[PDB]
Amino acid sequence: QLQLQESGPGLVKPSETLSLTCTVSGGSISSSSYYWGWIRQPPGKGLEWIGSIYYSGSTYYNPSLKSRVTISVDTSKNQFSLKLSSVTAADTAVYYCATSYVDNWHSGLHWFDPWGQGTLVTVSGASTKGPSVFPLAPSSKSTSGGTAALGCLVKDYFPEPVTVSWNSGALTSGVHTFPAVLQSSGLYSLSSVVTVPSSSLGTQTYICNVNHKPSNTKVDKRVEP
């Protein structure tokens, strides 16, 4: 029931510093025999440990990154933080925080559990672009009997990700949010589709909630017949 949540910017310019924070709940960073860690995973690649910190400040870092890594802890807020300097495209990755129960670090017995959700950071000199959200009006042709597919096209945003919910999280059945395509322009597009009863298209209201955190853009798009 220890839970970890990453936060921080999704876009960093090459040569600048990447900063992330992990907020812990359900257990204490301070006064605990735990090392609080950062791990990353470039898209489609493997896991890599970045470093870990004990609540009173002692750190261990990945030797391949140590010259660029600073991990810090704020026990009063039950948070710990990562700074990675002089970034390049090689540092584009999903960044996870996690924790390790540790009796003695150098016994080398410890593992990562639990893990945070991960947050994507893209290293790029391109500017942030918010999405254009267009409704995809319902069509019955491709779906099961008495149902229709409707959705939202989330076009031309950068960087990833966008989150899409339906009716502010109330509508979850039949929702399929597809992975984005990266266009030659360097901008992403994705679509989210929900299959709903045909009979109530005139009496229910369907709204896609698009959140693009990197541009601080939120769109709630009504999808009408």
Binding site: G46, Y96, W115, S191
Partner: protein, 214 residues
């Protein structure tokens, strides 16, 4: 690159036993340090699968087991299930420098014998709102197909359109089938001047073609 080494892919038949290896050196696994395993379902964070060479967390089926021997370790899965398709990572500790938590590069596990699934195809025309903004995008959404390979072609009326097409790689769904999206960019004038456009999906020698008109 990673400090420990795993086969990029491993395959097994349903109900049979498969192993995923993890090799290191006398500075990590061979130095006496424990090996742990993480399971990563697509699009999800890794989760602990085995700790301390052979211990299972609660919530992990007893079909998973772990062992270590010399400079290597092995994840074993009995009674292989389709739901075991995932990426698997080993992890240990290396004492050659300052004390390093190190990973293998990951193994994608395929469960053989999955039946073929034909793609479900939903094709949306450009929205009136997009056309009013002087743009036009056709959206072809492809889901529930297996194996994970499709080709998508677009047609203006009956003629292939090669320009302005962006298509995702196939991505694994939670049900082990695959999804993909294809997008055709047009001007509003192109969209309105043709009698229709089509998205044609080819999969395992069969084709599904959906067509929309202004």
């Amino acid at each position: 690159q990673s400090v420990l080494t795993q086969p990029p892919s491993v395959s097994g038949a349903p109900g049979q036993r498969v192993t995923i290896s993890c090799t290191g050196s006398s500075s990590n696994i061979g130095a006496g340090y424990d090996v742990h395993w993480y399971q990563q379902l697509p699009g999800t964070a890794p989760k602990l699968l085995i700790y301390g060479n052979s211990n299972r967390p609660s919530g992990v089926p007893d079909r998973f087991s772990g062992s270590k021997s010399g400079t290597s370790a092995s994840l074993a899965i009995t009674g292989l299930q389709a739901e075991d398709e995932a990426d698997y990572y080993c992890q240990s500790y290396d004492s050659s420098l300052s004390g390093d938590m190190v990973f293998g590069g990951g193994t994608k596990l395929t469960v053989l014998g999955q039946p073929k699934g034909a793609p479900s195809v939903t094709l949306f025309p450009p929205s009136s709102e997009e056309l009013q903004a002087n743009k036009a995008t056709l959206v072809c959404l492809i889901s529930d197909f297996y194996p994970g390979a499709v080709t998508v072609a677009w047609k203006a009326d009956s003629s292939p359109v090669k320009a302005g097409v962006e298509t995702t790689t196939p991505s694994k769904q939670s049900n082990n089938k695959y999804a993909a999206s294809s997008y055709l960019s047009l001007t509003p004038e192109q969209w309105k001047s043709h009698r229709s456009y089509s998205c044609q999906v080819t999969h395992e020698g069969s084709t599904v073609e959906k067509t929309v008109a202004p």
